[PDB]
Amino acid sequence: MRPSLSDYQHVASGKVRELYRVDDEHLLFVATDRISAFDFVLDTPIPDKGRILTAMSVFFFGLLTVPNHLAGPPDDPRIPEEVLGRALLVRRLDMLPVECVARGYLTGSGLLDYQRTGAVCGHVLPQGLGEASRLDPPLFTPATKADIGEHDMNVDFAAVVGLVGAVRANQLRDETIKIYTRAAAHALHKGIILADTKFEFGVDIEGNLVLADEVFTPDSSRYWDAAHYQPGVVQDSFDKQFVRNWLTGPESGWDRASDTPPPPLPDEVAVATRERYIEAYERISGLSFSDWIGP
C-alpha cells in the first residue's frame, strides 16, 4: 500500500522542490518544508509548508479551466506515504524555456527596470509610477533562467518569440494574462492581493499547451494583505514578513549585507509563519487545512 520514495529515480532538485521519475510518462513533484529569504535557503524548515503549498496549487489548478499537468488525485496510490499531501503525480511534458510572469503591480525587478529605463520587458510605461503602483492592464513580463544562483533575466516579447515561436509566444502572453487576471480577482475578493505570479508551461504529445510547475503559491507569487495595500511604499510579504523582520532585526545577529548565510530561525517565528500559510490557504480556498491529506 503505496511505494517507497526510494522506488523512484530522482531527476532534479530545486532549492525547495524535488522531482522524481515514476515511469516514462509520469513524474512525482515534491514540495519540501524549506523556505527561501534574501535568496538563501534557510536552515530552519517551516512545518507543513510543503503540504500547504501543495494544497494551494491544487486548489488553483481546480479553479482555472486551462489544461494542466496533474495526472492523478492528491491521494493517488503512486504517491509514497512519506510525502503524502506534499507530492503530486504529474505528466511529463516538453517544457518551454520561458518564465511566464504577469505583474498587476510594479515592484521588484519590474520596478527596478522601470526606474532605470522607463520600460519593463519592452513595455514603455507612463511616467510617474513607483513602488507598488497598480498596473492596468496587467503586464506580461517574461524572464529566462540564468546561471546557478543568479536571478532570472527579464526579456521582451521578441525574446520570447525567439525561444518558442511567434504563434506560441502570442499564446503564452494571452494565457498568462488571462489566468493571472482570473486568480487575482478571486484572491482580492477574499482580501489577498496577488501582486504578480510566475508560470511555467510545457507542451504535450499533441502540441497542446499545458500549465505545469506550481500555480499561485506564495513562492511563485507575491501575496499581499489587501487591507493594508498602500501604493508608494514596500508592501509586507503576507507569508514571509515575520522571517524577514527577525533576520534583519536586533536579535538575529546577522548582517544581511555580508552575504554570509543567515542563522537559524526561532521556533516561534517558524510556527507563526506556518500559521500565515494556513491563513492564506484557508482564506483563498474556503477549505480547511485540517482536511488536507498527510502521513
From Swiss-Prot:
Transmembrane segments: none annotated. It holds the Pfam family SAICAR_synt. InterPro entries: SAICAR_synt/ADE2_N, SAICAR_synth, SAICAR_synthetase_CS. GO terms for biological process: 'de novo' IMP biosynthetic process. Disulfide bonds: none annotated. It catalyses: 5-amino-1-(5-phospho-D-ribosyl)imidazole-4-carboxylate + L-aspartate + ATP = (2S)-2-[5-amino-1-(5-phospho-beta-D-ribosyl)imidazole-4-carboxamido]succinate + ADP + phosphate + 2 H(+). Keywords: ATP-binding, Ligase, Nucleotide-binding, Purine biosynthesis. Its EC number is 6.3.2.6. Signal peptide: none annotated. Pathway: Purine metabolism; IMP biosynthesis via de novo pathway; 5-amino-1-(5-phospho-D-ribosyl)imidazole-4-carboxamide from 5-amino-1-(5-phospho-D-ribosyl)imidazole-4-carboxylate: step 1/2. SUPFAM superfamilies: SAICAR synthase-like. GO terms for molecular function: ATP binding; phosphoribosylaminoimidazolesuccinocarboxamide synthase activity. GO terms for cellular component: cytoplasm. Belongs to the SAICAR synthetase family. PANTHER family: PHOSPHORIBOSYLAMINOIMIDAZOLE-SUCCINOCARBOXAMIDE SYNTHASE. This is Phosphoribosylaminoimidazole-succinocarboxamide synthase. It comes from Mycobacteroides abscessus (strain ATCC 19977 / DSM 44196 / CCUG 20993 / CIP 104536 / JCM 13569 / NCTC 13031 / TMC 1543 / L948). The gene is purC.
